[PDB]
Each structure stands twice: as structure tokens, then as C-alpha cells.
Amino acid sequence: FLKGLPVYNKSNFSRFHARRPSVYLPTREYPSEQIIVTEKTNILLRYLHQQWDKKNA
Amino acid sequence: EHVLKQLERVKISGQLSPRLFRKLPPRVCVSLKNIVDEGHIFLGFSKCGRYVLSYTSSFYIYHLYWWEFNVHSKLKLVRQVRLFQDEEIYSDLYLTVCEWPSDASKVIVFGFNNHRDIYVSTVAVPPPGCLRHGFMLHTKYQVVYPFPTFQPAFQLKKDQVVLLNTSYSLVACAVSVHSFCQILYVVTDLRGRNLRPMRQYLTVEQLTLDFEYVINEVIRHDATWGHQFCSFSDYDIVILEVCPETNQVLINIGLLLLPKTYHTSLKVAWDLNTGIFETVSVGDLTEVVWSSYRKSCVDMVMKWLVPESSGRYVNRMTNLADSERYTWIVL
Amino acid sequence: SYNYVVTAQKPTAVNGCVTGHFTSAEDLNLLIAKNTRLEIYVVTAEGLRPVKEVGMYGKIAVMELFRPKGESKDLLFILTAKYNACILEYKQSGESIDIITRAHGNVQDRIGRPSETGIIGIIDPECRMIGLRLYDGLFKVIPLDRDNKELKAFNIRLEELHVIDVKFLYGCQAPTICFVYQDPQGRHVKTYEVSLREKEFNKGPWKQENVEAEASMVIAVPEPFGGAIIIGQESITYHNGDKYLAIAPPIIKQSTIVCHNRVDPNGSRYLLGDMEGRLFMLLLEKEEQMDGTVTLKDLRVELLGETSIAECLTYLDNGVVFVGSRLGDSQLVKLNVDSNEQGSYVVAMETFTNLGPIVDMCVVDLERQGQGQLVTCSGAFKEGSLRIIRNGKLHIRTVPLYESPRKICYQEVSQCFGVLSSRIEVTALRPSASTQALSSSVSSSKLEVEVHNLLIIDQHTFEVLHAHQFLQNEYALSLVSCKLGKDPNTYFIVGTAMVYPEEAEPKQGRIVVFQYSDGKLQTVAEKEVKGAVYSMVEFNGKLLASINSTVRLYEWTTEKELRTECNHYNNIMALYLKTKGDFILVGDLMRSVLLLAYKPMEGNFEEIARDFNPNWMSAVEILDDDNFLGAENAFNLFVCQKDSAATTDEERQHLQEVGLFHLGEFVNVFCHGSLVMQPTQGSVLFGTVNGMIGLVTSLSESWYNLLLDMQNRLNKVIKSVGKIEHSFWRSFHTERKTEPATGFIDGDLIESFLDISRPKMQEVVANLEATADDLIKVVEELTRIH
Ligand SMILES: CNC(=O)C1CCN(C(=O)c2oc(S(=O)(=O)Nc3ccc(Cl)c4c(Cl)c[nH]c34)cc2C)CC1
């Protein structure tokens, strides 16, 4: 179990021995870059439609 | 692993669900000896677990009653209905009641007695405690000798629409009290309060589909063998899956179209919102039978079955145990 | 009735655990979800430093950090318990903190059964898509293409129907998922190659292989090793292509592994946490293949040491690892290259106070002056402690017990806190407060294994004066201290039950009355009862002890023995008892709540009213003679009031729910009291499993209407991270149905007022005139209660 553990910053935690964060309440808002929408169509219907479309071609 | 350990584990975990309690035996039982009517035939507990259904079937009258239930106290009836009005029944008959997945304002009872007839009537449930509007519709549809399949789960999967397959159509009657569902874009009588008023106010859509017309249109406008096999002899239609999210239904249709007789299958997706829309989704071939089609359809639906939450499901009772509340009544 | 919910102490139990460069591309950050309290930290030379703490309108269930191509810093995908998936980014302009939502939208299906193991969320290593497991048989997949304006999530049927853990493998041309599901034969491992163009699964590589019976989690090793590691009780197996490695060391056998983390970026070292707070380092040994690649020759595990019971580990730079604890205080333990003389490679550095599961509590005023402080029972197994939560920010005195505390009830005559607790014995694993005491006694009744014992704690210094041990195989269920009948003294009544492996339900119990004389506790009398005494409460001087599915009233006779008076068998499981005056409130486990009454004229129980709705109650409190509050397993609060206005026998015996609220936490106990020095008429304290402590206060009709209007106006002027509507967040939600919250004013939202900008405050009351000073005054008055 020897150790050569990673060091991302050689100085981090070097002065440990020589308070909850302030709450964030936003007043302004920017338009959402995108929207997430679930697919309501039944997967069985999608499967059968795909099969029929493949057959038609 | 005992029940006390489960409670201790819940107190800290914060996760308490009925599933984790399945292992333990029932919590409350009943002898059903003293707490019984007198010729009642109990049908089972309610979805809410607050009533117990039953009927008598004394021509036949076929009364049905509710039964408020208590662990130790005797059952107290709440309601009494006819459920078969103006119908002189000269057959034994078979009753099976089932409630809607989400809506809990009514239940649908079915009757099963060369051509057959079926009695289906909805009955409003007692008010929890408007409190005045309670109704019960009646209707009869006769089926052809090749009697159609019967499957409550998909028939009542819609929140307020029940799909009736009459062997010539797939009428889907929707009833609400209070704005459109059938074409939002079978004769039914009115009852309730021992009166038959003219139809807050109730509603009846009764949107129909023509099987013969749909099949004729599909074969005319599809199918590889459009140059042969004109017309058909008989067919059977079974519902594969109903999609309340977008109001669509899947139906599997088998035919026996013909000096060349062969059996063929088909499928169509009917969209409730836009009425009669036979959007074909499969075309089979005629080969040199009904039971085989039923077996194939049941296997196909089973293969694609997705489990549904215990919150929504079409409970079916016919003739007791309440799994959710771990209640049991022994006959 | 109209009530007002406010949070006295925010939740302190860690639920989510992630690390990554979020605030900026050049600073390490540590994010902790807790319960609906997301906190952002940054690693610095002095140590972890707070940055911001956004309160999401939902229970954080999934947190993942991912950096799609062409992004300077990582994004944050968050899915609430109410299915509110939304990707967030942290953009700061100078000294202004801003957290925009990349994307947002509900992902609830409404036609699926929630999975037994809970919500699982993963993201492709290449960020090609986001995988969600929410229901049995369905695996929602969200494409991440940032070209169009819509993210069309689509479900793919899962034939397994019993999947437990799902992970995205590494170094595959196409996004594949490796998961462990369960079948009647046993558990198995299977792989699917997900396709977004075809929206269907594909036959994955290294076809399914059977796995151990207790396989519980899957870890996706990165390159150059690749493959997956399945961790199960007394079994660790690594599967990759033809190669298959397994190891079952003895050390792991003691306890199960519940959490994992990756130390080396190449996956050469992992940290595993056990239920007993053991820290294991998992090693992968590689060899130089003929071609010149890495093959993971062998596997091996080591015991680093012991830490607080972990729900998560997250390794930080310089060897220090943060231990996210749910049943105890979190830690910042650091690993040491050289072992300790005792044989521990891990030494703690800092401890974060965690109120943990608030199993039971009771306010006391031992300091006089009409000032009360909360005494609770935190911790689960070895973090069990009593937290003396006073009021200053709250100063908390943690008294470690090293054993699970069950109940607590303070007795004033002897000035001692009678407390139930249970340890685990094989004999004694570790020294516990029970093991060492000034005096100790063991039950002498003639009527691993857990030992239960009702031990008393001093009120001043909290040294355990005496530790009474119960009969073997006997469980301590409920505890009460009160005066009975005509006796001048006070007894310590404790309800206990007997457990045997043969039976799955209790069949024998005990009701023992204790008296703490001088420095010893003796048994004056005892009663044997068929069943388990779930709960007990003094009722008009009679012990209203509840047995399994029954309730009883006991009279303390002159012979100093308990004699039953009347019973009420119409119950499924009577687990909660709250009494006001001559009224009784029985909170059934699966039968919502019922109200009873005792008639002195007839001396018999007469059921009066009952709530017919189906609910799984966790605690019940009687706010007043009419309004009865209750909390259910779905993390919602509801108050039902007895209705006498309607002149109907059926209506009279009907309890209508006139209040609904989605608290968002599992409430364990209610107790009457307040923390402030002795508009709202009464206050009720409740403790949750997440350690949150809140107040519920009644409001007059006019004040409730005013506050409801103020909150509705405020919703417009306050933006929510993730774009989640407050009405939807607080709307009562459960599997059966979901309805908007009514009769409950979210005090947390109201308190936000008087903290928003002055123009915002004016816009809230722009046309109400009330100006702004009046609103500030009323908000400060409401705040002063807690
Ligand atoms: C007669 N075979 C059975 O009963 C088997 C197979 C069907 N089954 C289900 O799992 C199930 O049934 C429904 S249903 O719509 O209420 N009934 C129903 C649906 C579909 C078909 Cl194809 C048929 C046929 Cl054919 C007769 N009944 C059908 C819903 C579900 C989840 C019960 C066990």
C-alpha cells in the first residue's frame, strides 16, 4: 500500500496549521442556453414505426 | 429479518417503503364468520383499502354494495346499486369489478352471461365525506359468435376512457362531470338516484372506430397482395398497448381473407386525438388459428411489458387480501 | 388551519460527493450536496475554503462534473429527487457570483416504477450523453449535442428489470454501460452499447459473466487498464474482455463496502469504505506486455485504518481525503506514508459537526430563566452521541456515546437523562459508554447480537451514572418518565420487547418501572405483555402503553403493580402516541392517523375521528385540540383538523386534510417547545434524518393570507438556480397523487425577503400601501421566533 499519491498543487494544504458558505440568492436571470424535454411517445410505437419505415425503404 | 430491525433501520436511513415490508406476514386478519351478510358474494378490498365490494344476484336484480371496513368492528354497508337496469337476465352471469388507475370517482362492472351479450355499467363511488352528484350508466353490446377478448388493464388504462370492443368497432366511451377527450384535436342509459335524467353535468363522448372500413382502407392502400385476395371472411382484434401520454392505442388484427384460403395478421395505431386514423404499422402474408393469434399477441405484449408503479394500476376483483395494507380476510 | 414552516438548523448529513475544477479552470473545488444544500469549496494552502452555497429547490439525488469539448471549465449536472435534471455552470464576473443554468427540464416519466436501489446517474467519459436510471426497465438517455435548442431525452427498454449499479466504461469506440442485475439464478454482469442515432442498445463486448451473490457496485477503471471492477461481500472481481481476475481476501469479509473513489488518475489506486468505518486502499498491479501495454496483472487490497462511517470518499490533492459521513461527523483525514505505532495509516485533521439522524429529542430548561435547549440522539452505530443544541449560529455540545441511542426522556427529580441505547456484541467490539459506568446492573427477571440497555446520563456533566442492561435478546422500544397514580415518586417506565431468530414478529414483551435512588437504579415492578411495547405515554396519570396493533390503559394500583383498564384493538401498528388533555392521537404505520378519547364516566375508549387517507406516518403531533399535524414517508407534511361544523355522524368521524406541504426530509420526532427566551400562537420542533431542525407555527387567517400573497409576489422577483418553480418544489407529491401545497407558508422563502436587494424588496410590495419598512418589520418579527 505504498504511497506516491497525486499532487495537483504542491502548495495546497501546506499551511493547514500554519464557517459555512454565504448563501446565494439571485435576483437577475439569464435566458437558459438549452431545454431538456423527455420523449413521451411510447417506445413500442417508436420500435414498430422504425421497423415499418425500414421495411418501406 | 424481523420487523423491529426494519423499523430501527428505517429510523436512521429515512427510507420507508411498502416493498421492504413484503417479507413479513400479514399484519391484520379477519375470520369473516361473524362479519358477514346473513347471500352476499364478496369481491375484494378497494384500492384505497377503505371499502369492500360485494354483490348478491338474487330475471335477476344483481345488487351491489359497498362495505366500510374495520379491523375489529363489523363491516358497515354504505351504498346499494342495481347495476343492471331494465335488463331481464335469463342467464347465470359473471361479475368482475375494477377501478381506474388514477381516477377514484367511479368503478366499472362487467357482466358475462349463438351470439353473446355483455352488460357493462359504471357506478359512482360514495363521496369521501359537491358530495351530491352520483350516477351510474348502463349499456349492452352484443358480440358475434367469435367472441372478442376481454382485458381490463388496457381497456381502463386511460384515466376516464373505457374501450369497448364490440366485434364491429372499438368504441371508447369517456364520462366526466364538471373539456373534450375523444376528438379533442352502443346505446347508454342514464341512471342514479333511482332516476334516469337527460344527459354539474355529466358527459358522454362515445367515439367509434370501424374495423371493416379500416381493414378495407388499409388493404386498398397497402399490403403487397393488392392484386388478389379481395374481401375477407372474419377477423379478430386485440389491443396490444395503450399510451395515455399521447392518447394512442395499438390493435392487432387477424383476418382469414381468401380457391385459396389463408390466415393473415395486421396491426394499426389509432390516435384518439384526431379520430379515425388507421396508421398501419405492419403487413403480414397469407399462409395455409385464432388461438394461435391470441398466443402470439400475448407473447408479444409480454416481451415488451414495462413494470408500472403501484400508484397506478387497474385493480381487478371477481368472485380477499389487501397487499398494500397487509390486510387479509379468509373465507 | 394555517401554519408556517421554517428551518432552525439546515441539514448537515452529506448525501452527494463530487470534486473537479468548477469555479475556474485553475482551482480545485469540492462540492457537497447534503440535503437540498449544495456547497462549493475550493482547496487552498490553508485548506478547504467556502465559496458559495446554492439552495436548490429540490433534493439533490445526482451530482456529476463533466467538461464537454470546447469548455474552459466543467459543468454541473444535477437531478433532484423530483426529477428536475438541469446542467449548471459557474460564471463569475470579477466579484459578482453568477450561476447560470446551461439546460433545465423535468425528466419524470410518470409511467414507471421507482427502482429499489434508487436513482442512478452517470455521464459518458467523452460527454457524449448522460445516462439516467430512474425506473425498473427504463434507462433514460439524454443527448448532449449543444447545437440545437432542445435536449430530447429518450428511454430505452432494459430487459434486466433488476439492475443495481450502472457505469459507463472507458476507452470504447461507442458509449457502453456495464451493470450488475439480479435474476432468480443470481446476480450477473452485462454490457450494452448505447446508440443515439438508433436510440437502442446493442450487443456489448465481453459478454455477460456470472458474479458473486452479493455483488453490490461497479467501478469503471479508466485507461490503460479499462474494464470494470465489481465489489461484493467477501469478493472483488475485475472483468475486461477475455481477462478476468478475482480476489476474496479475509479482511473484507467482516463488513460490506458501501462507497468507492479513484485516487490515481490512471485508476491504479482506489479507496473503499466499509459500514464499520474502515478505509481500504485497492491496488492494481500492471505488467509490461509483449506489445508494450498494461494488463493489470494482479489485484490486492490493504487496510488503511478506521474512520467515521462513510457515505462517500473524495480524494484531494496532497494526500488528504474528505470522508463524507451520513451517520456521523464528516472528516478531512489524511493518509501517511509511514504507519502509526498502532498500525493506522490514516490520521484525522478536521471534523465537521453533523447532527445526523435525529432519532429522538426533548427540550429541557435545566438552566432555568425560561430558556430551553434541545437535547437529541444523533449518530447510528459508533457515532452515536447526544447533541445539546443551545441558542447563541447555534452552539452544540456533542457527547459521544459510541453506541446507538434510541430514546431520551429527561427526569427532573433526579436531574438525569434516562436514555435507551443498543450496542453490537459478537464480545464487546470497542469500549462504549455502556461498558464503562460508575454502576452497572443486569436484568434479573425470571420471565452479531445487540445488547440493549436503559442507561441514565447526568444533566450537569453528562457522565453516565448507571447503565442497566436488559435481558438477553430483549429490545428497548420506548421510554417514558412520569408520575403514576397516587405515588409521590417518579419512575422510569421503559417498554421493551423480546426478539428471537425463529420468529419474524414479536410475541413477548415487558413493561418495567425503574426508580433511580441515590446512585443506583432498581426495579420496583414489571408487567409481562404479549407483544412488543412500541410506544408509551402518560395519560391522565395512567400509563397508555401501546402494544402491537393495540392500545392499553394501565392504572398504577396501591400494590405498586400495573392493572389494565381498557383496550382498543382497531389498529394495524400503533407506533406513535401524542396526547393533549383527554385526547389521544394514535399514528398508525400504514393507516394514517386516528383520534381517540377516554370517557371517565364510562372508563372506556371511544374512537372519535380518523383520517381515512392512505399514508405511511413517521411522526405525529397534535398542534391544538383540533389541528393534528403529521409527517409521512414521502417527505411531506400534512395537517388534518377534526370537523364539527358539519352535522353528520359520518362527517363528524371524518378528518379532512386541510394542509399539504412537501418538506423534503424524513421527519423522525415532534416535540413541543422553543429555543428562544420565554403573532404566532404556538411552536413545534421537529427533527429529520438529515439533521435538519425546523419550527412549525400557526398563523391567523389574515396573516396567512398576507404571507401567501407576499410569497406569491416574491416568487416572481426571485430567480431559482435550475429554473425550478417554487410551487412545484413545495407541492405535496407522492406516488398516489400530487397536489399544490395549501395552508403552509414556506418560512425559508419568506426569510429571503429582507435579504434581497432594495429594488427587489420594493418590487415585491410595489402595489400592495405597505411601502417597504412594514414588510421588513413583519419579516424581522417572524424571524425573531427562532
Ligand atoms: C390470458 N393470458 C394472461 O392472462 C397472461 C398474459 C396477459 N397478462 C398480463 O400480464 C397483462 O394482462 C393485461 S390485460 O390487458 O388486463 N389482459 C390482456 C392483455 C393482453 C393480452 Cl394479449 C391478453 C389476452 Cl390474449 C388475454 N388477456 C390479455 C395487462 C397485463 C400486464 C396476464 C397473464
PDB file of N, CA and C in Angstrom, chain C residues 490-537:
ATOM      1  N   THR C 490     -41.265   9.482  41.246  1.00  0.00           N
ATOM      2  CA  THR C 490     -41.268   9.371  39.795  1.00  0.00           C
ATOM      3  C   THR C 490     -40.514   8.115  39.376  1.00  0.00           C
ATOM      4  N   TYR C 491     -41.061   7.406  38.393  1.00  0.00           N
ATOM      5  CA  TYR C 491     -40.488   6.168  37.894  1.00  0.00           C
ATOM      6  C   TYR C 491     -39.973   6.350  36.474  1.00  0.00           C
ATOM      7  N   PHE C 492     -39.112   5.419  36.061  1.00  0.00           N
ATOM      8  CA  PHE C 492     -38.574   5.376  34.703  1.00  0.00           C
ATOM      9  C   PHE C 492     -39.213   4.193  33.981  1.00  0.00           C
ATOM     10  N   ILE C 493     -40.355   4.453  33.346  1.00  0.00           N
ATOM     11  CA  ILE C 493     -41.066   3.402  32.631  1.00  0.00           C
ATOM     12  C   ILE C 493     -40.464   3.239  31.244  1.00  0.00           C
ATOM     13  N   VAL C 494     -40.055   2.015  30.915  1.00  0.00           N
ATOM     14  CA  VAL C 494     -39.447   1.703  29.626  1.00  0.00           C
ATOM     15  C   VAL C 494     -40.167   0.500  29.038  1.00  0.00           C
ATOM     16  N   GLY C 495     -40.567   0.609  27.773  1.00  0.00           N
ATOM     17  CA  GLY C 495     -41.207  -0.504  27.094  1.00  0.00           C
ATOM     18  C   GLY C 495     -40.194  -1.287  26.284  1.00  0.00           C
ATOM     19  N   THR C 496     -40.201  -2.605  26.455  1.00  0.00           N
ATOM     20  CA  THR C 496     -39.239  -3.481  25.807  1.00  0.00           C
ATOM     21  C   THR C 496     -39.971  -4.634  25.137  1.00  0.00           C
ATOM     22  N   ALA C 497     -39.266  -5.308  24.232  1.00  0.00           N
ATOM     23  CA  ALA C 497     -39.808  -6.452  23.517  1.00  0.00           C
ATOM     24  C   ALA C 497     -38.743  -7.537  23.449  1.00  0.00           C
ATOM     25  N   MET C 498     -39.179  -8.756  23.144  1.00  0.00           N
ATOM     26  CA  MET C 498     -38.297  -9.906  23.017  1.00  0.00           C
ATOM     27  C   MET C 498     -38.217 -10.298  21.551  1.00  0.00           C
ATOM     28  N   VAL C 499     -37.006 -10.574  21.078  1.00  0.00           N
ATOM     29  CA  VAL C 499     -36.761 -10.931  19.687  1.00  0.00           C
ATOM     30  C   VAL C 499     -36.070 -12.284  19.650  1.00  0.00           C
ATOM     31  N   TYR C 500     -36.505 -13.142  18.734  1.00  0.00           N
ATOM     32  CA  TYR C 500     -35.865 -14.424  18.514  1.00  0.00           C
ATOM     33  C   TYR C 500     -35.686 -14.648  17.020  1.00  0.00           C
ATOM     34  N   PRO C 501     -34.566 -15.239  16.595  1.00  0.00           N
ATOM     35  CA  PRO C 501     -34.392 -15.500  15.157  1.00  0.00           C
ATOM     36  C   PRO C 501     -35.462 -16.404  14.581  1.00  0.00           C
ATOM     37  N   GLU C 502     -36.038 -17.296  15.388  1.00  0.00           N
ATOM     38  CA  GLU C 502     -37.031 -18.230  14.870  1.00  0.00           C
ATOM     39  C   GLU C 502     -38.254 -17.499  14.332  1.00  0.00           C
ATOM     40  N   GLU C 503     -38.734 -16.493  15.055  1.00  0.00           N
ATOM     41  CA  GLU C 503     -39.941 -15.770  14.687  1.00  0.00           C
ATOM     42  C   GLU C 503     -39.585 -14.456  14.009  1.00  0.00           C
ATOM     43  N   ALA C 504     -40.482 -14.007  13.133  1.00  0.00           N
ATOM     44  CA  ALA C 504     -40.309 -12.761  12.399  1.00  0.00           C
ATOM     45  C   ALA C 504     -41.163 -11.631  12.958  1.00  0.00           C
ATOM     46  N   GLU C 505     -41.909 -11.878  14.028  1.00  0.00           N
ATOM     47  CA  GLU C 505     -42.691 -10.847  14.690  1.00  0.00           C
ATOM     48  C   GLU C 505     -42.577 -11.036  16.194  1.00  0.00           C
ATOM     49  N   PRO C 506     -42.658  -9.954  16.970  1.00  0.00           N
ATOM     50  CA  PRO C 506     -42.585 -10.099  18.429  1.00  0.00           C
ATOM     51  C   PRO C 506     -43.801 -10.840  18.962  1.00  0.00           C
ATOM     52  N   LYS C 507     -43.596 -11.590  20.042  1.00  0.00           N
ATOM     53  CA  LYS C 507     -44.679 -12.294  20.708  1.00  0.00           C
ATOM     54  C   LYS C 507     -44.650 -12.124  22.219  1.00  0.00           C
ATOM     55  N   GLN C 508     -43.536 -11.668  22.783  1.00  0.00           N
ATOM     56  CA  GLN C 508     -43.413 -11.429  24.211  1.00  0.00           C
ATOM     57  C   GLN C 508     -42.814 -10.050  24.429  1.00  0.00           C
ATOM     58  N   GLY C 509     -43.230  -9.406  25.512  1.00  0.00           N
ATOM     59  CA  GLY C 509     -42.747  -8.078  25.822  1.00  0.00           C
ATOM     60  C   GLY C 509     -42.578  -7.875  27.309  1.00  0.00           C
ATOM     61  N   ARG C 510     -42.289  -6.644  27.714  1.00  0.00           N
ATOM     62  CA  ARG C 510     -42.141  -6.334  29.124  1.00  0.00           C
ATOM     63  C   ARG C 510     -42.400  -4.852  29.335  1.00  0.00           C
ATOM     64  N   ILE C 511     -42.956  -4.529  30.497  1.00  0.00           N
ATOM     65  CA  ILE C 511     -43.169  -3.147  30.919  1.00  0.00           C
ATOM     66  C   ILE C 511     -42.606  -3.061  32.334  1.00  0.00           C
ATOM     67  N   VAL C 512     -41.435  -2.450  32.470  1.00  0.00           N
ATOM     68  CA  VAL C 512     -40.716  -2.386  33.734  1.00  0.00           C
ATOM     69  C   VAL C 512     -40.687  -0.941  34.205  1.00  0.00           C
ATOM     70  N   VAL C 513     -40.904  -0.747  35.499  1.00  0.00           N
ATOM     71  CA  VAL C 513     -40.854   0.569  36.121  1.00  0.00           C
ATOM     72  C   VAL C 513     -39.586   0.641  36.957  1.00  0.00           C
ATOM     73  N   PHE C 514     -38.742   1.623  36.664  1.00  0.00           N
ATOM     74  CA  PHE C 514     -37.472   1.799  37.348  1.00  0.00           C
ATOM     75  C   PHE C 514     -37.534   3.004  38.275  1.00  0.00           C
ATOM     76  N   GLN C 515     -36.702   2.961  39.311  1.00  0.00           N
ATOM     77  CA  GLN C 515     -36.559   4.068  40.246  1.00  0.00           C
ATOM     78  C   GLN C 515     -35.077   4.286  40.489  1.00  0.00           C
ATOM     79  N   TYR C 516     -34.601   5.502  40.225  1.00  0.00           N
ATOM     80  CA  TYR C 516     -33.187   5.825  40.400  1.00  0.00           C
ATOM     81  C   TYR C 516     -33.000   6.456  41.776  1.00  0.00           C
ATOM     82  N   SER C 517     -32.613   5.619  42.733  1.00  0.00           N
ATOM     83  CA  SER C 517     -32.362   6.062  44.096  1.00  0.00           C
ATOM     84  C   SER C 517     -30.866   6.238  44.311  1.00  0.00           C
ATOM     85  N   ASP C 518     -30.480   7.401  44.833  1.00  0.00           N
ATOM     86  CA  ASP C 518     -29.077   7.692  45.092  1.00  0.00           C
ATOM     87  C   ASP C 518     -28.266   7.555  43.809  1.00  0.00           C
ATOM     88  N   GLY C 519     -27.466   6.496  43.704  1.00  0.00           N
ATOM     89  CA  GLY C 519     -26.670   6.263  42.517  1.00  0.00           C
ATOM     90  C   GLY C 519     -26.937   4.903  41.911  1.00  0.00           C
ATOM     91  N   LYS C 520     -28.118   4.350  42.178  1.00  0.00           N
ATOM     92  CA  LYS C 520     -28.480   3.031  41.689  1.00  0.00           C
ATOM     93  C   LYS C 520     -29.912   3.056  41.177  1.00  0.00           C
ATOM     94  N   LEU C 521     -30.172   2.226  40.174  1.00  0.00           N
ATOM     95  CA  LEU C 521     -31.494   2.071  39.587  1.00  0.00           C
ATOM     96  C   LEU C 521     -31.998   0.668  39.887  1.00  0.00           C
ATOM     97  N   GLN C 522     -33.190   0.579  40.466  1.00  0.00           N
ATOM     98  CA  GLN C 522     -33.783  -0.691  40.849  1.00  0.00           C
ATOM     99  C   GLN C 522     -35.144  -0.849  40.187  1.00  0.00           C
ATOM    100  N   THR C 523     -35.605  -2.093  40.134  1.00  0.00           N
ATOM    101  CA  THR C 523     -36.884  -2.440  39.528  1.00  0.00           C
ATOM    102  C   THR C 523     -37.901  -2.624  40.646  1.00  0.00           C
ATOM    103  N   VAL C 524     -38.888  -1.731  40.703  1.00  0.00           N
ATOM    104  CA  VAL C 524     -39.928  -1.863  41.715  1.00  0.00           C
ATOM    105  C   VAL C 524     -41.000  -2.841  41.259  1.00  0.00           C
ATOM    106  N   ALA C 525     -41.340  -2.834  39.975  1.00  0.00           N
ATOM    107  CA  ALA C 525     -42.373  -3.717  39.458  1.00  0.00           C
ATOM    108  C   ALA C 525     -42.181  -3.865  37.958  1.00  0.00           C
ATOM    109  N   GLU C 526     -42.813  -4.898  37.408  1.00  0.00           N
ATOM    110  CA  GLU C 526     -42.733  -5.191  35.988  1.00  0.00           C
ATOM    111  C   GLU C 526     -44.009  -5.898  35.568  1.00  0.00           C
ATOM    112  N   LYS C 527     -44.325  -5.807  34.281  1.00  0.00           N
ATOM    113  CA  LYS C 527     -45.510  -6.442  33.726  1.00  0.00           C
ATOM    114  C   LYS C 527     -45.140  -7.125  32.420  1.00  0.00           C
ATOM    115  N   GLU C 528     -45.601  -8.360  32.251  1.00  0.00           N
ATOM    116  CA  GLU C 528     -45.368  -9.112  31.027  1.00  0.00           C
ATOM    117  C   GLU C 528     -46.568  -8.953  30.104  1.00  0.00           C
ATOM    118  N   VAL C 529     -46.307  -8.562  28.861  1.00  0.00           N
ATOM    119  CA  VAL C 529     -47.352  -8.304  27.881  1.00  0.00           C
ATOM    120  C   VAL C 529     -47.034  -9.076  26.612  1.00  0.00           C
ATOM    121  N   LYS C 530     -48.038  -9.765  26.078  1.00  0.00           N
ATOM    122  CA  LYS C 530     -47.885 -10.499  24.827  1.00  0.00           C
ATOM    123  C   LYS C 530     -47.794  -9.492  23.688  1.00  0.00           C
ATOM    124  N   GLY C 531     -46.601  -9.329  23.137  1.00  0.00           N
ATOM    125  CA  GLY C 531     -46.345  -8.383  22.073  1.00  0.00           C
ATOM    126  C   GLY C 531     -45.179  -7.480  22.411  1.00  0.00           C
ATOM    127  N   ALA C 532     -44.996  -6.462  21.577  1.00  0.00           N
ATOM    128  CA  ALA C 532     -43.913  -5.501  21.727  1.00  0.00           C
ATOM    129  C   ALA C 532     -44.491  -4.133  22.053  1.00  0.00           C
ATOM    130  N   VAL C 533     -43.911  -3.470  23.050  1.00  0.00           N
ATOM    131  CA  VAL C 533     -44.397  -2.174  23.505  1.00  0.00           C
ATOM    132  C   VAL C 533     -43.773  -1.081  22.652  1.00  0.00           C
ATOM    133  N   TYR C 534     -44.391  -0.786  21.509  1.00  0.00           N
ATOM    134  CA  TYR C 534     -43.802   0.160  20.569  1.00  0.00           C
ATOM    135  C   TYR C 534     -43.626   1.535  21.197  1.00  0.00           C
ATOM    136  N   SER C 535     -44.661   2.034  21.861  1.00  0.00           N
ATOM    137  CA  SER C 535     -44.652   3.385  22.391  1.00  0.00           C
ATOM    138  C   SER C 535     -45.390   3.443  23.721  1.00  0.00           C
ATOM    139  N   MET C 536     -45.065   4.468  24.501  1.00  0.00           N
ATOM    140  CA  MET C 536     -45.687   4.679  25.796  1.00  0.00           C
ATOM    141  C   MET C 536     -45.823   6.174  26.029  1.00  0.00           C
ATOM    142  N   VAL C 537     -46.828   6.548  26.815  1.00  0.00           N
ATOM    143  CA  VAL C 537     -47.046   7.949  27.152  1.00  0.00           C
ATOM    144  C   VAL C 537     -47.978   8.034  28.351  1.00  0.00           C
TER     145      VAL C 537
END
